[PDB]
Each structure stands twice: as C-alpha cells, then as structure tokens.
Scaffold this active site. Structure first.
Site, mmCIF file in Angstrom:
data_model
loop_
_atom_site.group_PDB
_atom_site.id
_atom_site.type_symbol
_atom_site.label_atom_id
_atom_site.label_comp_id
_atom_site.label_asym_id
_atom_site.label_seq_id
_atom_site.Cartn_x
_atom_site.Cartn_y
_atom_site.Cartn_z
ATOM 1 N N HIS A 104 6.623 6.972 5.635
ATOM 2 C CA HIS A 104 6.090 6.594 4.342
ATOM 3 C C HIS A 104 5.370 7.773 3.769
ATOM 4 O O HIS A 104 5.240 8.825 4.427
ATOM 5 C CB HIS A 104 5.122 5.386 4.470
ATOM 6 C CG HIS A 104 3.960 5.716 5.317
ATOM 7 N ND1 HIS A 104 3.926 5.538 6.672
ATOM 8 C CD2 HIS A 104 2.758 6.281 4.992
ATOM 9 C CE1 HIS A 104 2.760 5.990 7.145
ATOM 10 N NE2 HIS A 104 2.019 6.454 6.153
ATOM 11 N N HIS A 127 4.409 10.921 6.130
ATOM 12 C CA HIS A 127 4.059 10.588 7.496
ATOM 13 C C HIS A 127 5.266 9.983 8.205
ATOM 14 O O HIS A 127 5.716 8.889 7.831
ATOM 15 C CB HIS A 127 2.910 9.574 7.523
ATOM 16 C CG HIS A 127 1.640 10.176 7.076
ATOM 17 N ND1 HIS A 127 0.534 9.427 6.659
ATOM 18 C CD2 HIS A 127 1.300 11.466 6.985
ATOM 19 C CE1 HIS A 127 -0.421 10.275 6.339
ATOM 20 N NE2 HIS A 127 -0.009 11.525 6.537
ATOM 21 N N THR A 161 -4.551 6.267 9.170
ATOM 22 C CA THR A 161 -5.300 6.496 7.945
ATOM 23 C C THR A 161 -5.442 5.282 7.073
ATOM 24 O O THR A 161 -6.042 5.332 5.998
ATOM 25 C CB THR A 161 -4.750 7.665 7.114
ATOM 26 O OG1 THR A 161 -3.505 7.272 6.569
ATOM 27 C CG2 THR A 161 -4.637 8.950 7.932
ATOM 28 N N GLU A 184 -3.447 13.358 2.026
ATOM 29 C CA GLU A 184 -4.557 12.832 2.837
ATOM 30 C C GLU A 184 -5.234 14.009 3.572
ATOM 31 O O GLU A 184 -6.408 14.298 3.372
ATOM 32 C CB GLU A 184 -4.033 11.764 3.815
ATOM 33 C CG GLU A 184 -3.545 10.541 3.071
ATOM 34 C CD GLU A 184 -3.575 9.296 3.859
ATOM 35 O OE1 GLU A 184 -3.029 9.298 4.987
ATOM 36 O OE2 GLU A 184 -4.130 8.296 3.351
ATOM 37 N N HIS A 189 0.829 -1.207 0.000
ATOM 38 C CA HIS A 189 0.000 0.000 0.000
ATOM 39 C C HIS A 189 0.873 1.271 0.000
ATOM 40 O O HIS A 189 0.349 2.288 -0.398
ATOM 41 C CB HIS A 189 -1.043 0.043 1.133
ATOM 42 C CG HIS A 189 -0.606 -0.360 2.511
ATOM 43 N ND1 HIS A 189 -0.271 0.542 3.491
ATOM 44 C CD2 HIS A 189 -0.459 -1.582 3.095
ATOM 45 C CE1 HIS A 189 0.056 -0.038 4.594
ATOM 46 N NE2 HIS A 189 -0.056 -1.314 4.403
ATOM 47 N N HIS A 238 1.996 9.107 0.962
ATOM 48 C CA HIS A 238 0.822 8.924 0.169
ATOM 49 C C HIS A 238 0.923 9.863 -1.005
ATOM 50 O O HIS A 238 1.386 10.993 -0.825
ATOM 51 C CB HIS A 238 -0.467 9.213 0.963
ATOM 52 C CG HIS A 238 -0.541 8.471 2.228
ATOM 53 N ND1 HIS A 238 -1.201 7.263 2.367
ATOM 54 C CD2 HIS A 238 0.042 8.672 3.437
ATOM 55 C CE1 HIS A 238 -1.040 6.801 3.594
ATOM 56 N NE2 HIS A 238 -0.297 7.647 4.259
HETATM 57 ZN ZN LIG Z 1 0.287 7.456 6.218
#
Ligand SMILES: [Zn+2]
Length: 257
Positions: free
Chosen positions: A91, A116, A195, A103, A61, A93
């Site tokens: 990591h 994050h 999240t 996010e 992911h 997004h």
């Molecule tokens: Zn995250």
C-alpha cells in the site's frame, strides 16, 4: 475511530493505542549523516518472480494490493533479516500536495508518497501471530517523487475508480510488484512499528535510498480516492501519513557507504 482528520489523527492515537508513545515507533526521520554503514548486513534478496496478487481493497485508510501468502511465492530475505518473510500486501501513503505524503523523511525531507511492501516472518505461521513478535514483520519502504511516470504503477492507478470508497474491493490478479522497485537496493534499516493502529512494535524497516518517480497524473489519481463509504459524505483520501516519531534508543544502519 482513528484516522487522519483533525479530530482523530495521529496526535490522538495514543488514547486508544498507548504504544503510540513507545520505544520503537515508526516512521522516523533518517538522518543520513548519522546513519552508520553496517558491514555485517547481508545482501538483500527480493524474490518476487512467483508473486500471486489477488485483490485490491480500499480499507478506509489506504488501498492494499493483496497477495497469496499461503506459500513462499514472493519473499524477502537477507539484509538485516534472519529467515524468510512473505509478501502479504503493499500500500501507499500520500499527500494532498507533492511536497508531503511520505511517512519516513530523509534529512527532514518529505517525499510525495511512500510505498510499503509488507512481509511476515514465516516462523510465526500467519500474519496475525507475526505482528505479536518483535521480529514478525519486514516492511520494504520506497519513496515516491513526482516526475516521469512509473509504468509498472499504471495498472494500479487504473483500477482505483473501481475501489473509490471504503470497503470496495476488486480482483487484481497477475500484478508484478517488481515493476515498483528502483534500480538500486541500497537501504537504511532500523527496528520499528506499524505506522497505523495498532502501532505494534513488530517491524524491521528496510527503507530504500533510491526513490521511484511517478507522474503528476498518477498521484492525482491516488488523490481521487475516498476515506468514506459509498453514500457517506465525500472526504478525499489524502494526507494518510503518520509524521516522524522520536528515534529514542535506536541506531539507523546503512547497507552502503
Ligand atoms: Zn504503510
């Protein structure tokens, strides 16, 4: 299983993770005009000089850069936090296009990506115990916009070809996460959640006001990663973001005027 497709994306997660419809879910929209300055915050302390990165992993992911969290080597303190929070991983997004990927949003604006830096409260002994607590984690969130390259990101970008597919890892020692921070530590903070599933309501979010800039080429390399395993149909790892969730009975506080 959960993911970011049409059939298994954020709008489906509640079926396996009913806490998706909870009282303190993340991310949220940050309404800059309603956030309130909080005089009582303490200064934020980001102490990354002794950080020990170990490995980078494509978990299907995102990719996580993992740290040695068996001692207080890279820690977050201060701000809204009581006690000491140890860096376990960071990591990102990101989007398929530069106009989405974050996010959190700021006055409804989406950034190209969001970093994050995940930390856990050392009073709880390990990450797995920390995620069961309302004050278990502190996540430092940093927006990415596309512009100039981020020099301190390049070492991450160039290992991504070695971890293209789900389940691949590579050694990733001696990476300095200080090279991912903006100049200012001004921030917004609020109580929220993971999240990704299991969406546990264990996070004090600290979202920096100043974005970092990365280049087109850097983000394009993120977009070459795969959600799938090697030998499975190729599906590009893009749009791995959860959208903003209702604020409900929360106030976002600002560290700055
Ligand atoms: Zn995250």
């Amino acid at each position: 299983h959960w993911g970011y497709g049409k059939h298994n994306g954020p709008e489906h997660w509640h079926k396996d993770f009913p806490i998706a419809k909870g009282e303190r879910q993340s991310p949220v929209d940050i309404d800059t005009h309603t956030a309130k300055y909080d005089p009582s915050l303490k200064p934020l302390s980001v102490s990354y000089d002794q950080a020990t990165s170990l490995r980078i992993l494509n978990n299907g992911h995102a990719f996580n850069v993992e740290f040695d969290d068996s001692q207080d080597k890279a820690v977050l303190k201060g701000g809204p936090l009581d006690g000491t929070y140890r860096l376990i991983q960071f990591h990102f997004h990101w989007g398929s296009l530069d106009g989405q990927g974050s996010e959190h949003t700021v006055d409804k604006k989406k950034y190209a990506a969001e970093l994050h830096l995940v930390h856990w409260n050392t009073k709880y002994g390990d990450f797995g115990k920390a995620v069961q607590q309302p004050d278990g984690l502190a996540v430092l969130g940093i927006f990415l916009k596309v512009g100039s390259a981020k020099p301190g990101l390049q070492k991450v970008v160039d290992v991504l070809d070695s971890i293209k597919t789900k389940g691949k890892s590579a050694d990733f020692t001696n990476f300095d996460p200080r090279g991912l921070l903006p100049e200012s530590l001004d921030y917004w903070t609020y109580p929220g959640s993971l999240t990704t599933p299991p969406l546990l309501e264990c996070v004090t979010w600290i979202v920096l006001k100043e974005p970092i800039s990365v280049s087109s080429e850097q983000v394009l390399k993120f977009r070459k990663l795969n959600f799938n395993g090697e030998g499975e149909p190729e599906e590009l790892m893009v749009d791995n973001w959860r959208p903003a969730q209702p604020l409900k009975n929360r106030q976002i506080k600002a560290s700055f005027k």
